């Protein structure tokens, strides 16, 4: 018997995605071929271990699939080693921390309120539970990272691992300087490029590979692949230690169907069209932030160098939670986000985060940003309304989905 | 541009699956509708948090999907609470350990050599790195667990957590006895039913829900669902604590496409046909074990109560490693497994584990077990040959995949 109830819900979700403007910076729309691989029979095989070194037999074809994903990842990012088995970005980070540190050691990452991710040292996350955390933020004036403040914190606290990269920082990272700082205290530099991995692949964002000891990432987000994790390094000796932490360290069997999807995603990222897409992603982000600033909205750091930006809603008397709800009411999805030196608690926040990778995949161009900017503005000032919801629907439907 | 290289490999793997006999106890073949859900657009949504309490907008449909999976899991197993977000079995156990123990605490599980799982205390696994481990095994004379030995160890080491459940134990578990032991020392009883979950759902195996404080499992294996984890309990308060460990504790965004697949698998398991399937799984295992005993092999414990059984190859002078290779050469996959107090090292062993869930899914019935037994025996005695490989191939092809 077919589970009609469940499939009816899947159809409702397709409709929602098609009829709205998805502006959550961490989302995107995978291609049909990525889905074809993820929904393949590769899920019926237990492949504990690594290619050529599996626990069980019958992995001759799976080994070629995994190997292909590994080599393409290496080729795509210019890395000497890769591990494509992490179930997620969080497991990728977990593995790296456990390979380089012992519980109790000191970890240094970006403060959550300044843009850091939960896995960069939050007390409610494994990172802040097993390790002593020291965070760095951004300057109160420019809202940019001050490298001398980072240097100071490193010398004072002597972290074993320093993490660069974030989930809500809209400017470029100076990886060379972060490596110099880590070298000053004998720490490992770990770059979590999950958010900008696609831009790095397209050559539109500095590559951390040569400067970081280890690089982690998600395969979804700007890389536009399936949901999963990835770990890279220019040092294969360090890589061997990390492989051991992924399995048998923290995971059991890998999701080989997902890994097949990663291989397809890397193949897609290697095509010239991916660079054109990535360029448009950034152009859309700059133009959209610009149009919102023209309407009186304050953009953190005054703009963006990547695919995302933050809007400070304090001057407008709106909390991030309220903005998110008013936009969601009309089909525009974003997520409330804390801003630097946010006076309000994380459950409420004073701003919203916006990203363009998803709408750019749907074919939106910089010339359409002024229109998107107008819908956001009205939803926030005039609030939800049927006429507004319809205008959003029509705009969305005029753009296809992969 | 289609990734022809990758898709050519997917076709080869399908051909491999069709033409061979999969006897690895942890394997199974999922239905078309389970793959359809896993390959759905639900992968495009970030949905951190839980139903009604997410960190992003646009989760209205996803909430109905996850709630559906939760409620079906509760009805299927007779539970008061459930968490369907774990990426795997390993993450389900990790979350439970971290919610119940602090690093340094003592964990008690079944010895890996006796049938326990990597996550039950192995030194190369996170369980053995973060916690002090005490292991229990089987008696050389009975080949079964000795509850008095378990009790003794418990009183002597005072573990914070006692894990029941294994990956290679062919008999029923006395959950009531285990809980009595746990109460006596003030420990939590955690049951990992990953392997036998499908049997529990079909009511063919004692249900651990009423006796354990927490129950973990995989959604694949005898439950025949997609690859992933699951947590259940009869205590909602404890459940709320475990929800926090899954997120924001150890994971980030859940795989909602996989959770949709879990919902479908639970739907399939709630149908009367699943009970007939599971009845056949157990009958095939008992019958195949009998047929092999009749042909000169010894069955550990003399038989089985579930879907798997251990073969002692000593009567025929073979090691598990050799048996594994000889079988693999003719398209029959099994895995080597130590027998109680194996005289051979662990990388060699004197036995093999055989499980019937996968062939049963393909339509094999008890009357055909004698034929599978003969093919296994001929491959081990005569060794691989083209003629034998063709006989396996034809038998396999005559039993379609889902």
Numbering used by the authors:
A (entry chain B): 1006 to 1407
B (entry chain A): 6 to 407
What does the paper say about this structure?
Serine hydroxymethyltransferase (SHMT), a ubiquitous PLP-dependent enzyme in the aminotransferase superfamily, catalyzes the reversible conversion of L-serine (L-Ser) to glycine (Gly), transferring a one-carbon unit to tetrahydrofolate (THF) to yield 5,10-methylenetetrahydrofolate (5,10-MTHF). As an enzyme in one-carbon metabolism, SHMT is essential to the synthesis of thymine nucleotides, purines, methionine, and other essential biomolecules. SHMT is found as a homodimer in prokaryotes, such as Thermus thermophilus (Tth), and a homotetramer in eukaryotes, such as humans.
Although it was expected that L-Ser-d7 would displace Lys226 in the Schiff base linkage to PLP to form the external aldimine, the intact internal aldimine was observed in this structure with the sulfate ions still occupying the substrate binding sites in both protomers. We, therefore, call this complex, TthSHMT/L-Ser, a pre-Michaelis complex, in which both protomers display the same open conformation observed in the substrate-free internal aldimine joint XN structure. In protomer A of TthSHMT/L-Ser, L-Ser-d7 is observed in the zwitterionic state with the protonated α-amino group facing a hydrophobic patch made up of Leu117 (Leu166 in hSHMT2), Leu123 (Leu172 in hSHMT2), and Phe252* (Phe320* in hSHMT2), whereas the deprotonated carboxyl group is directed into the bulk solvent. The side chain hydroxyl is positioned towards the substrate binding site next to the sulfate ion. It is important to note that in the TthSHMT/L-Ser joint XN structure, we found the same protonation states in the active sites of both protomers that were observed in the substrate-free structure.
